[PDB]
Design a protein around this nucleic acid. Structure first.
Lengths: 360, 184, 122
RNA sequence: GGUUGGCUUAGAAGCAGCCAUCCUUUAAAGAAAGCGUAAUAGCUCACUAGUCGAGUCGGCCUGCGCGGAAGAUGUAACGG
RNA sequence: AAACUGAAGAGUUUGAUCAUGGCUCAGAUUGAACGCU
RNA sequence: GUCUGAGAGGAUGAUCAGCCACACCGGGACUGAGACACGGCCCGGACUCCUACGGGAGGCAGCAGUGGGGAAUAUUGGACAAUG
């Protein structure tokens, strides 16, 4: 059901069927037809290259499981991982092309992509009266750091939510309104908020997104202890005091996607560095060989590059069978401890859709 | 006569002009010439030779004359093909080459040339993906060696026995070759 | 003498008709641009469906001024308008026709096509 | 020298990490104290023999010093 | 002597019917294009 | 006139013939029997070109033909032998 189990499960044959699928109606009208077409493809493929008994057994096992599917609660892709024994049915957001892969292992490259796309971060919400802190992973709020968080127990700074109970906000103080110390007081309040954020970050380091009015964001920026840890600043999020934590998370999504895009833009420079050092392979067969013998450190794939090839394992040659040679290379790189990065089609040219930064 | 095509444009009332360094031979107004390479061979005739916005008497070897064509619609000619004397030079895709693999001191790669390698081949003014095919007894070519290999380009390229090309991967030179035989 | 917030007529065919100086370039407190000086402008009124649109920020070179330009013999040469010619992002002319005269201060390398396209060069 | 000790790991070879740290030829040499390698390679060290000739090596304690030691009108932190 | 010669309907609303009424079709024509030949 | 229609009507105005208007855009006229002149003039304009930078040249909606636009439309042919 998870990427771990799918990658660690072996079968013969193992069938991965990926069906293009829609969230809304009437777009989801074709999801039953698309699934049925994709199942016809695999039925005839299995009957052709294994036998009628294997084909009918696998297709019966997956039919019994896809009969329940509502098709009204579809995500943006429906993946089916079938063997003669077990059948797993997952709905992935991301994307994929309608394809049938039959091999000794499941086509888990799209799950690898989704896993490699994940970002875990803090969201510091600032107003002139209060600060909030939300821990987040992609689209969802992990925790909102209230008194019930139990990670604020040994806090030496003010724990979240930090209300601005400064002297000028209540009226005891010194230097009444004629002094015009509001900016200095608000600067120090955001400095203390930053102190709390840094205290909580020093145990669970991960980047922060600063959310709030443009003036508050900037006052915070010229006060933050580690301003180079800030990945994004969102100044058009609404109802920052009473709003839902999930609402804040939904607000920061354009910034988070921009940060992912910037991460790929940066990986461009890593490829150039490897090319200069002559430790980069871009030929498909060379990439396969280096990935197979554990020499691959970082694989870069054009996000949709799918090539079928006549892979020979013992002879260690690749010619153009395995329907996902790129997927097999991804699996080898992940297995031998390397990383996989799926770059957008405009960061990576269609001339060179794959690039392995090798270990030596 | 041969001239690789670098730039293609069209002038109203005059026709398609193909610019390029004339490699050899002579071209003058009225000469019949064929456009050989990438696509299928097509004949045509010369109507104008000009450079620096002035008409020239005839384009000779070395000079950068841009020759004008008759009836070519500027889409049947592209960067990479050669303007050649008819009959001379045939568009090939399978050719044997005496390829020397660069070492790591002249650029080159740290890994050998192995059968099934697909680098880009630059001949005169274009690069085309190829398919190195070593003969029997050779499985890989050590960086620094030189050997005869067969190449199956992805589209035809006009070549003759003795033309020098360069091999490249990722924009850096991985070897230099000279054609020794052209097969069909 | 052109300064920020000065309107200049456009002396080429790039579609703009009036530009406003928003920066005099080439110095941290530089006050004035004369002929041959590169300025940052916004185009304030352009012709419909031209190359340049109203509100665009771009480079120009001053090609004539009302203050005048001095010559080595001590003469001054003045014009009836302040006029610029729009430039690329690499400070090269984007003009195929130059309107009105220009001066020989544009002689050099980067404004040679302005000089050769002007109807007359003083 | 056994020997890339075993395990691990993509690798894992004295030198990522974990468990041993044994034997041999010895004058001596560690299942290695560093550098180095993707891992190897490589350069050292410990240790022994030779040369040299007389004192030398390392911890502990005490006294007085040194660095750590940047601010705003003028030296300007012995009153001179 | 002659120029004086010309006129077709079908399907589809209903459980079925008649009417109404639209839509569609069979013909002729072209400075025609396109597809196959 | 053409197509359709039994007709009445409906649609249409390629090729052939009559009439009109136009000749890169605006304006003025000259010469002449006749022009406000398609391959004439003057002035102005836009565009293309030449220039020694002072100044100049041009108008295929004639026949071929080129670029372009387009679903799409031809030869850079011959002769004045015939009718004019």
């Amino acid at each position: 059901a998870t990427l771990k189990s799918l990658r660690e499960t072996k079968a013969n044959p193992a069938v991965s069927i990926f069906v293009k699928t829609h969230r809304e109606h009437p777009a989801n009208d074709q999801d039953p037809i698309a699934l049925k077409n994709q199942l016809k493809i695999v039925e005839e493929r299995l009957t052709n290259e294994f036998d009628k008994r294997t084909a009918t057994t696998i297709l019966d096992k997956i039919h019994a499981e896809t009969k329940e599917y509502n098709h009204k609660y579809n995500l943006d892709t429906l993946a089916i991982f079938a063997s003669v024994d077990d059948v797993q049915l997952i709905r992935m957001p991301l994307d994929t092309p309608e394809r049938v892969v039959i091999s000794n292992r499941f086509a888990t490259r799209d799950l690898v992509r989704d896993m490699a796309s994940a970002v875990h971060y803090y969201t510091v919400v600032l107003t002139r009266d209060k600060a909030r802190l939300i821990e987040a992973a992609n689209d969802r709020v992990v925790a909102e750091f209230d008194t019930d968080n139990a990670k604020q127990n040994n806090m030496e700074g003010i724990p979240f939510p930090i209300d601005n109970n400064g002297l000028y906000t209540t009226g005891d103080g010194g230097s009444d309104r004629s002094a015009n110390n509001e900016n200095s007081y608000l600067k120090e309040f955001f400095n203390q908020v930053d102190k709390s954020v840094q205290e909580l970050w020093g145990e669970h380091k991960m980047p922060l997104v600063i959310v709030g009015d443009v003036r508050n964001i900037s006052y915070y920026k010229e006060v933050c202890d580690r301003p180079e840890n800030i990945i994004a600043t969102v100044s058009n999020l609404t109802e920052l005091e009473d709003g839902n934590a999930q609402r804040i998370i939904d607000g920061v999504q354009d910034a988070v996607e921009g940060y992912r895009t910037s991460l790929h833009e940066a990986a461009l420079g890593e490829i150039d560095k490897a090319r200069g050092a002559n430790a980069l392979s871009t030929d498909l067969q060379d990439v396969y060989r280096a990935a197979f013998q554990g020499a691959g450190e970082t694989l870069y794939v054009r996000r949709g590059y799918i090539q079928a090839a006549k892979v020979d394992e013992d002879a260690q040659t690749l010619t153009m069978v395995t329907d996902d040679a790129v997927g097999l290379i991804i699996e080898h790189v992940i297995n031998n401890g390397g990383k996989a990065v799926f770059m957008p089609q405009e960061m990576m040219s269609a001339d060179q859709p794959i690039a392995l930064v090798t270990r030596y | 006569f041969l001239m690789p095509i670098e730039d293609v444009f069209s002038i109203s009332g005059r026709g398609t002009v193909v610019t390029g360094r004339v490699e050899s031979g002579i071209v003058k107004v009225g000469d019949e010439i064929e456009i050989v390479g990438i696509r299928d061979t097509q004949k045509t005739t010369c109507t104008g030779v000009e450079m620096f916005r002035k008409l020239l008497d005839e384009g000779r070897a070395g000079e950068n004359c841009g020759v004008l064509l008759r009836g070519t619609k500027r889409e049947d000619v592209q960067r990479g093909q050669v303007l050649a004397k008819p009959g001379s030079i045939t568009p090939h895709t399978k050719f044997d080459a005496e390829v020397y693999v660069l070492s790591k001191e002249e650029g080159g790669r740290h890994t050998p040339f192995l059968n099934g390698y697909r680098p880009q081949f630059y001949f005169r003014t274009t690069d085309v993906t190829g398919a190195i095919q070593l003969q029997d007894g050779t499985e890989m070519v050590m960086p620094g060696d030189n050997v005869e290999m067969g190449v199956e380009l992805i589209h035809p390229i006009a070549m003759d026995k003795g033309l020098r090309f360069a091999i490249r991967e990722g924009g850096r030179t991985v070897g230099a070759g000279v054609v020794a035989n052209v097969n069909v | 003498m052109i300064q920020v917030e000065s309107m200049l007529e456009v002396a080429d065919n790039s579609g703009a008709r009036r530009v406003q100086c928003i920066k005099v370039l080439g110095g941290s407190h530089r006050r004035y641009a004369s002929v041959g000086d590169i300025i940052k402008v916004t185009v304030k009124e352009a012709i419909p469906r031209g190359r340049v649109k109203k509100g665009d920020v771009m480079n120009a070179v001053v090609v004539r001024t009302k203050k005048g330009v001095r010559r080595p013999d001590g003469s001054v040469l003045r014009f009836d308008d302040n006029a610029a010619v729009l430039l690329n992002q690499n400070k090269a002319p984007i003009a195929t026709r130059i309107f009105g005269p220009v001066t020989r201060e544009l002689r050099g390398d980067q404004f040679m096509k302005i000089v050769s396209l002007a109807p007359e060069v003083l």
